[PDB]
Design a protein around this ligand. Structure first.
Ligand SMILES: O=C(O)[C@H]1O[C@H](O[C@@H]2[C@H](O)[C@@H](O)[C@@H](O[C@@H]3[C@H](O)[C@@H](O)[C@@H](O)O[C@@H]3C(=O)O)O[C@@H]2C(=O)O)[C@H](O)[C@@H](O)[C@H]1O
Ligand SMILES: [Ca+2]
Ligand SMILES: [Ca+2]
Ligand SMILES: [Ca+2]
Ligand SMILES: [Ca+2]
Ligand SMILES: [Cl-]
Length: 198
């Protein structure tokens, strides 16, 4: 394990970091603390720590409290080795269509959702651990567009509500090596047949 060269530094930001199409923000292990951008509560008016334009990537950051509105993904994004020490309103939101992959990293202390899917997308969570969360994934309530969610090598502990929840009959969730401890219910979808193993 080559810990990153920014390990032990703390970057204090006062505005959202915008990552551009085709760019990769590599924190090299930096911890980020956002100020004036939200308190990490459930209020819906906080700023994202990062905005990933379509085709932007992010890797190797620690997001400290306050988690604000987390990471906003506009599609075709890879988010690797991101650690949310204390999820804010939500950890990451898919805002526009495309494939979004969360690979590695972890999240803790999500009062409500970790991942919030507000546009049709393919959403994959791989090699990920989350602890003390309300939900891992929420498709925006009362929407009926299609998401396809993959949970692969995912370990969850203390899930207050459910692993994932969608109000869309056409959405699907697929899982493979999913470990869940202390969870109220696994899936809240219109029908359980929308959930598959692979
Ligand atoms: O992108 C966002 O942050 C998103 O947040 C709100 O919606 C989510 C969710 O999509 C809604 O279904 C709703 O969730 C329900 C409750 O209001 C919530 O407190 C918790 O109990 O879960 C419920 C559920 O899953 O059905 O509200 C969510 C939230 O409060 O984060 C916005 O309504 C939405 O417009 C958007 O900003
Ligand atoms: Ca919420
Ligand atoms: Ca919300
Ligand atoms: Ca949010
Ligand atoms: Ca929190
Ligand atoms: Cl919840």
């Amino acid at each position: 394990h080559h810990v990153g060269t920014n390990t032990g530094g703390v970057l204090v930001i006062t505005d959202t970091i915008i990552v551009k199409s085709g760019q990769t923000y590599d924190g090299k292990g930096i911890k980020i603390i956002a100020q004036g951008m939200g308190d990490g509560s459930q209020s819906e008016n906080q700023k994202p720590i990062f905005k990933l334009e379509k085709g932007a990537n992010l890797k190797n950051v620690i997001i400290g409290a306050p988690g604000c509105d987390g990471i906003h993904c506009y599609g075709d994004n890879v988010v690797e080795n991101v650690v949310w020490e204390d999820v804010g309103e939500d950890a990451l939101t898919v805002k526009s269509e495309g494939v979004v992959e969360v690979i590695g990293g972890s999240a803790k202390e999500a009062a409500n959702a970790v991942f919030q899917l507000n546009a049709p997308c393919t959403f994959k969570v791989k090699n990920f651990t989350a602890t003390n969360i309300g939900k891992l994934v929420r498709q925006n309530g009362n929407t009926t567009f299609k998401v396809v969610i993959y949970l692969e090598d995912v370990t969850l502990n203390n899930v207050k509500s459910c692993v994932a929840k969608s109000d869309s009959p056409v959405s699907e969730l697929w899982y493979h090596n999913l470990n869940v401890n202390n969870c109220k219910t696994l899936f809240e979808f219109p029908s359980q047949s929308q959930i598959h193993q692979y």
